[PDB]
Design an enzyme around this catalytic site. Structure first.
Site, mmCIF file in Angstrom:
data_model
loop_
_atom_site.group_PDB
_atom_site.id
_atom_site.type_symbol
_atom_site.label_atom_id
_atom_site.label_comp_id
_atom_site.label_asym_id
_atom_site.label_seq_id
_atom_site.Cartn_x
_atom_site.Cartn_y
_atom_site.Cartn_z
ATOM 1 N N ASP A 107 -38.833 55.236 16.364
ATOM 2 C CA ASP A 107 -37.471 55.715 16.125
ATOM 3 C C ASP A 107 -36.853 54.946 14.965
ATOM 4 O O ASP A 107 -36.197 53.921 15.147
ATOM 5 C CB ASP A 107 -36.634 55.584 17.391
ATOM 6 C CG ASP A 107 -37.207 56.380 18.548
ATOM 7 O OD1 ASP A 107 -37.946 57.353 18.287
ATOM 8 O OD2 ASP A 107 -36.921 56.034 19.712
ATOM 9 N N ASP A 113 -45.189 59.847 24.216
ATOM 10 C CA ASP A 113 -44.115 58.942 23.833
ATOM 11 C C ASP A 113 -43.848 57.973 24.979
ATOM 12 O O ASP A 113 -44.315 58.162 26.107
ATOM 13 C CB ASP A 113 -42.846 59.730 23.466
ATOM 14 C CG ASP A 113 -41.789 58.872 22.787
ATOM 15 O OD1 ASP A 113 -42.123 57.777 22.288
ATOM 16 O OD2 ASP A 113 -40.615 59.299 22.753
#
Ligand SMILES: [Ca+2]
Ligand SMILES: [Ca+2]
Ligand SMILES: [Ca+2]
Ligand SMILES: [Ca+2]
Lengths: 107, 153, 85, 597, 597, 105, 150, 84
Positions: E271, E195
């Site tokens: 996200d 990430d």
């Protein structure tokens, strides 16, 4: 003789460079049938007689999921015992910072 | 809880040694020849009859109806630990005075009464009374034990 | 000769050799108590020495030990030891 | 003939024993307190309700909990942060992701007039990037082994070393670490919790430090063990004092303790379990601590381990509400049990318990001031108040707060009633819920419901209350007082009330406080000064008087120095003999008298 | 006359452009794949269901989540560990309190035949006690500034430095860090999530690295930016291969990516938010990625930010179940939403979606093998399959999986039906739930309930399924196959099936695999080899055949090489024209034929 | 700022100055283009003449919104053009910040 | 929401410079005298008419019906970046052949057809055809821009 | 000059026992502006915006509850208007 100097419990060894150095003293309380104090124990307010079993232990220890109604030493230690009767009250303050065991017997 | 993690008195060697002493006549006895009475304390030597190790008893009457008993080795190889920072002050003392005497006992009066301490020399013992009502006795069951510092190895 | 087996819900009547033949023939799954063939079946752990237990048929020979006695894994490559103690 | 024998056996040190001859138990309290000191006066907020768990996840979670108390109308003074708030159990630090702005979080809590407590444990992670570890290592302030190396054990952060808190230079370093420059992110409304200070060592003998480790002065750990925790408690409290320049009173909770630990703050009974028998044992455990000078005692409300059923949690809130240290806490793997997460019936019983505690804050504060000045315990066994009633000598499902309130909490699932022993040959007792008078001595069967907390006020006492419950104690500290007068058989009563700014040493350094005596006899209630040296600027006034056991007067007149005689309206209940005097309106700093004509 | 103009504007570098002339879109797929490669073949487990959130609390929580899936009869292959599992966001570490025995946790998951994924981000905490930081600094492997010092920015662990992944020496170091000796606590069933590898820099311009930072060879960050993440993905995937000795296929999820990222694993849309329009947009976002070679695509099921209502969560599980990368994930401050925490009606619909996904695993696996070998996308816009139907050129609430399944998930709250466009002249479509046949082209209004997932199988295709759903894919990989034959109007159908051991490169290094061709014409279903080089030892057999659109035969005869001719029993539904052939019992590695007489 | 350039509080010393490159492409018969992820936008790409170009620059956008051409986490500089008659693809192999304009006729 | 964190094209100075160039007659022109047909590619110099900057066009027909266009500076002060590690291989090339030529253009054939590339010298332009069907044009709107290293 | 009557219909008190900082009505209706009643409410007018009722116990508690700050008029906390 055994354990007076170098002493092992489970897998831990105490090199005990000073050997046996313990101190002890007894006290008699005429007219007293009820004694209290010496925390900390998960036990009754009125302290029990120790003749048939373990003495009360004062040694600050972390006991995981401690149980009730037994004289095992818990996290704190206050070496102060109070004696109460209809006639009088007394207290004993044993100013010692080492591991301490306390025996209580009736008459 | 795992109770094998934590020592019993039998698994604590000093507890086992102490608890093995059974009630009887104490082998400790006070040498009344050694008594010294100061304004603040009474000092007196103790001796173990079998081992001949010599101890010092410091007996003190204190203000607010209190008595202090301190016992150490006479000439230890190294000083023993005395707990600091717990007492908030030097406890004010009350004067002790000889009020009764014989070969095997000494009676002391704190200030002007009513508290008195009778020291019996053999076997060593201490009794505390208000006037003549016995409040408590010390070493009455003879369970006193003072392991002096032995020679290293 | 020999008699056929009937599903407990009454769904059908099949020969005896289609019981535990690793194909689901009964709507209630009652024809495959020993295999993973029926989606709504159950497998019985006898578990001698502990409490017996029923498990889903889908957990028979899935490589995971579900019964404490290990009997649910008999042809899966996983060897389960008895843990009913 | 009956006699009891006591024998002490210690591993090292000298024989050193104090005999405290009474003759009364309060004489023994005074004798011991003259030796080891008295309970430190807690800041008022620390006598409120504490909401804690392992762990609140981040700043957003803390602020959500804060808002939950206000949204559900429940008071709370402190929210606690357990070990997950720091950077990998490196104490004095903050997790850079979940607590990136501690100052902003604390400022928000201050805007709600609430505090925060952060945990600081004595074990220091062995880590060359951890500034605390590097300083202690470079200055030789760690506990040592016989080979001269720093002792290393295992605890929450893995491998850790243990500061030698018996070293005065170490305690001074620790105290200075709590300055706002050193403890970055801290603020005046942040307080401290000392855990694991036995010390706890996961791979050590009996989960503690080796006997032959070496401390300051060459002493072995076996010589000093039982005062290691006290030194941690002491040095932490001293740090909270000096960080303010010596003005603010500390709050530090400690798990380990020794004789004299009462001088440094609070203690609790450690990691208990969510079971009914653990609820029961909280009374004898804190009572045994109260008798030896540790008045600031409590147990984890709801139990630390495992999940309590809703009824047990309600009963534990009721029990904790009448115990000195009032904190709910929970283990990492328990479900969330903030009090508003329960069904409405359980919420209401808990809210009622919280309201009772907050209303009694002036009473709690005064009892702790009397403990601070005299050495008298706050929570008391019945035999302390009735030394000649032999049937009380073993009671431990009951206790008293001072001499005024007798408490018998419900501690059994599905109970329909309790058996309450009301002692005293010449005593009368008032049920504070119904105002029913009860004659002593007797064992009374009292029916209970889920909301019941059996509390009785003794005749001859005056209990002060804040009847305006707000969201925290800070909000309430200027509010008016209601006085509850319980009349003795002779028609008399008396009580005290201590007031100050609530958090500083000004009461001692500047005599800025009030100590009032309220006394009732005949038909007159009088307020006078119990200590004239104390003066205080305060808006606190007397808004109401409730008198239990009084007849209906023809008129009620108030007299205050500096004011003309005034008439007060009143209401009287002939069934319960309860008289309520409306709005006396007099300043609590003034002498006054109320006469029933 | 209609024309579109495209203009590219880049900050630095050369002009370098490939023109791919088709003429068909599959020709363009082949052309692009020859340049940048094909989708890496995922290990089978990574095509199952992934359960994730920020964050799972400790080992006990992970084991509880694992047990919850089995207790509520829901399949799941992987449980994910976000950043709170490490020591203060020091990657390659474990929190000493909450994850003290990672090997034991991984062992317990292995005993359930499940995997774990741990997050490893590229930013390295500036910390002299962090061995990763010390090595990278001591070997000069960090991105630097113009003055020659190591670049320092801000991210999850606070101040952090950024390895220069454009340096081959750095990628080799990174890959070697994943060896079981270096990454202590890791095991063969632990995989990785990359990430924040854009790279994300909280205090940098546009939340990323400065343009004038300096990389390997003196190149500026402005020159290399868009391949920084790909290099992280690449070096991580190589490390998972090298730790096994070159035998195990990797699984790595990456957030940042570039041309060629398909060679290293999966990506997801970052996200997103728990809202209906974010559910809708997952289709065009993954479709735009599928068209450019990134077939292993998905979006957070339920939304990352905020709390989805239960109906939205159900619809998102149904949507995700038919998308390539199938993971539920959630922000730190969201409520727990493991699928068994909902009411029974919502649980059952979610379980039904999970069962459909697991039963379709052989179909998914074959589609990804075709992507791996040919460069054809798995998830496809309708216009890819119908290039002459102009009404499909913009469709984005509908998609196809290969050429066989058309999917139109419900993406509106309280919907009573959907409008499904079934394209193709002379084409037929079968509702897989009801077996109703529908002729194309048409827009069909289909009524739906909470449990509905509108899925249609195209006539002329054969879909393989594992009808025995177990707790994870590892449990199922030796189970028998059911073939679903959807007959065309000409009475024909065809399909493929790829099988191997499910997780190694043996299919490529040893040709240990099967590729079967299933074809139906006349009245005969034939299995033959689509690739003779592939042989495999496997117990997989054909347990059932389901034929949609067939009449009732008089007899069914099976012929397989090595066996005598056998008769098969069958069942026929005259209402739906569905034929079920019972237990062919033939090995999937064998040539065979079934004749309907 | 062709050379030294600042945006918000961040400064780009840009020691090499302006070095950008650009090129246009005409697709006769094409009305539908697709690709160049990643954007929270429709499958069929929109014309940019009236607004912003599509941006390709891997960026971490907190709480990103829908139906806008802002650059998200990934960048694949590949555009596909589809018509009834043919299919074409453009692969712009550049690793720097890239903007893409789309116009119809 | 406040998106001022991220640049628009106007706030990106290179995007602003590039996007300000509008469709029109390109100043770039191919020098057909410089044409070289190599084993893998066709190279030819380009020049900016106003600034006299010299570029190099590398034109390639590839197997599988692909064309690669690469443009760099003739004599750069410093090397420009060429994206590594993305292409899995050196793309196999197809031979280019001149099949038409006039004053302003050169027609190239890929292998043996049907794909052809027409290079217009002035203004620089590229057209790609299958036989005689125009598939695509390069720089038809004259938007080519190559900022050389100062 | 007429006396005030509680809204619950219980009792009647003189005008000067309204907002006199003592609770005289069972429903709390005699102290709308103070913190004297446990079940009272305080009305934030919030001129130009959304009005709001708050608990009487939050009048002059030192905490800003109304966006217009009118709940804090004698507490030492000065609340600024934030109703925008
Ligand atoms: Ca069967
Ligand atoms: Ca099994
Ligand atoms: Ca009033
Ligand atoms: Ca307020």
């Amino acid at each position: 003789e055994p354990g007076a100097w170098e002493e092992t419990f489970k897998t831990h060894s105490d090199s005990k460079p000073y050997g046996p150095t313990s101190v002890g003293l007894d006290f008699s309380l005429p007219g007293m049938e009820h004694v209290y104090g010496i925390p900390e124990h998960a036990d009754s307010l009125r302290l029990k007689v120790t003749e048939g079993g373990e003495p009360y232990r004062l040694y600050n220890l972390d006991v995981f999921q401690y149980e009730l109604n037994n004289p095992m030493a818990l996290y704190g230690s206050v070496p102060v015992l109070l004696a109460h009767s209809f006639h009088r009250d007394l207290g004993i303050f044993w100013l010692n910072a080492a591991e301490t065991w306390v025996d209580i017997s009736s008459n | 809880v795992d109770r094998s993690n934590f020592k019993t008195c039998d698994e604590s060697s000093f507890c086992k040694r102490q608890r093995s002493i059974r009630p009887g006549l104490s082998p400790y006895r006070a040498l009344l020849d050694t008594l010294q009475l100061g304004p603040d304390a009474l000092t007196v030597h103790l001796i173990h009859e079998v081992t001949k190790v010599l101890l010092v008893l410091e007996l003190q009457g204190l203000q607010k109806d209190m008595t202090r008993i301190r016992i150490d080795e006479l000439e230890p190889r190294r000083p023993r630990y005395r707990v600091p920072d717990v007492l908030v002050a030097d406890p004010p003392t009350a004067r002790l005075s000889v009020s009764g005497r014989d070969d095997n006992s000494v009676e002391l009066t704190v200030a002007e009464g009513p508290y008195k301490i009778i020291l019996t020399a053999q076997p060593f013992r201490l009794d505390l009374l208000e006037d003549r009502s016995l409040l408590l006795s010390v070493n009455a069951r003879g369970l006193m034990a003072f392991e002096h510092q032995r020679a290293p190895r | 000769e020999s008699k056929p087996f009937t599903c407990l819900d009454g769904t059908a009547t099949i020969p005896f050799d289609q019981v535990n033949d690793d194909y689901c023939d009964c709507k209630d799954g009652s024809d495959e108590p020993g295999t993973a063939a029926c989606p709504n079946g159950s497998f019985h752990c006898t578990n001698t020495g502990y409490k017996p237990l029923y498990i889903l048929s889908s957990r028979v020979n899935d490589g995971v030990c579900d019964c404490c006695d290990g009997t649910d894994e008999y042809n899966s490559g996983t060897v389960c030891e008895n843990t009913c103690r | 003939t009956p006699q009891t024998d006591i024998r002490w056996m210690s591993e090292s040190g000298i024989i050193d024993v104090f005999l405290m001859l009474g003759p009364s138990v309060f004489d023994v309290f005074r004798q011991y307190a003259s030796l080891t000191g008295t309970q430190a006066l807690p800041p008022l907020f620390s006598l409120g309700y504490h909401q804690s768990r392992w762990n609140y996840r981040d700043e957003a979670d803390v602020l959500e909990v804060d808002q939950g108390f206000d949204d559900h109308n429940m008071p709370c003074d402190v929210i606690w942060l357990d070990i997950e708030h720091a950077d990998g159990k490196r104490y004095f630090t903050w997790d850079p992701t979940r607590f990136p702005q501690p100052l902003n979080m604390l400022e928000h809590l201050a805007s709600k007039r609430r505090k925060l407590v952060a945990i600081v444990d004595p074990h220091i992670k062995v880590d060359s990037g951890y500034r605390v570890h590097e300083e202690l290592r470079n200055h030789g302030l760690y506990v040592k082994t016989r080979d001269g190396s720093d002792y290393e054990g295992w605890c929450w952060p893995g491998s850790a070393s243990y500061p030698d808190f018996t070293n005065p230079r170490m305690r001074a370093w620790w105290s200075n670490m709590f300055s706002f420059d050193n403890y970055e992110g801290s603020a005046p409304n942040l307080y401290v919790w000392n855990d694991m200070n036995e010390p706890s060592v996961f791979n050590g003998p009996e989960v503690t430090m080796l006997k032959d480790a070496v401390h300051y002065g060459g002493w072995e750990h076996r010589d000093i063990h039982n005062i290691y925790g006290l030194y941690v408690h002491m040095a932490t409290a001293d740090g909270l004092i000096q960080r303010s320049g010596g003005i603010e009173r500390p709050f530090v909770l400690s798990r380990a303790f020794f004789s004299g630990s009462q001088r440094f703050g609070a203690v609790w009974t450690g990691d208990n379990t969510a079971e009914w028998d653990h609820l029961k044992i909280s009374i004898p455990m804190c009572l045994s601590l109260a008798l030896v000078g540790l008045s600031f005692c409590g147990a984890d409300v709801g139990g630390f381990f495992k999940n309590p059923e809703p009824e047990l949690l309600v009963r534990w809130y009721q029990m904790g509400a009448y115990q000195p240290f009032f904190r709910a806490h929970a283990h990492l793997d328990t479900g969330r049990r903030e009090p508003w997460l329960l069904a409405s019936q359980y919420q209401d019983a808990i809210r009622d318990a919280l309201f009772q505690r907050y209303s009694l804050l002036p009473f709690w504060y005064t009892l702790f001031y009397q403990a601070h000045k005299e050495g008298f315990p706050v929570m008391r066994p019945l035999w302390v108040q009735y030394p000649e009633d032999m049937s009380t000598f073993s009671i431990e499902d009951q206790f008293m707060l001072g001499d005024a309130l007798l408490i018998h909490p419900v501690s059994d699932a599905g109970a329909h009633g309790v058996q309450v022993y009301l002692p005293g040959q010449e005593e009368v007792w008032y049920d504070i819920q119904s105002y029913q008078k009860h004659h002593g001595p007797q064992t009374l069967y009292l029916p209970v419901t889920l909301s019941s907390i059996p509390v009785f006020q003794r005749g001859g006492t005056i209990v002060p209350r804040w009847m305006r419950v707000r969201r925290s104690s800070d909000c309430m500290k200027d509010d008016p007082i209601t006085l509850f007068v319980a009349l003795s058989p002779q028609g008399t009563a008396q009580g005290e009330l201590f007031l100050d700014d609530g958090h500083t040493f000004n009461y001692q350094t500047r005599h800025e406080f009030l100590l009032r005596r309220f006394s009732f006899s005949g038909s007159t209630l009088v307020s006078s000064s119990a200590d004239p040296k104390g003066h205080l600027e305060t808006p606190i006034w007397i808004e109401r008087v409730v008198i239990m056991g009084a007849g209906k007067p023809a008129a009620v007149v108030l007299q205050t120095k500096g004011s003309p005689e005034s008439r007060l309206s009143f209401q009287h209940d002939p069934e319960t003999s309860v008289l309520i005097l409306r709005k006396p309106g007099v300043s609590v700093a003034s002498d006054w008298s109320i006469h029933l004509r």
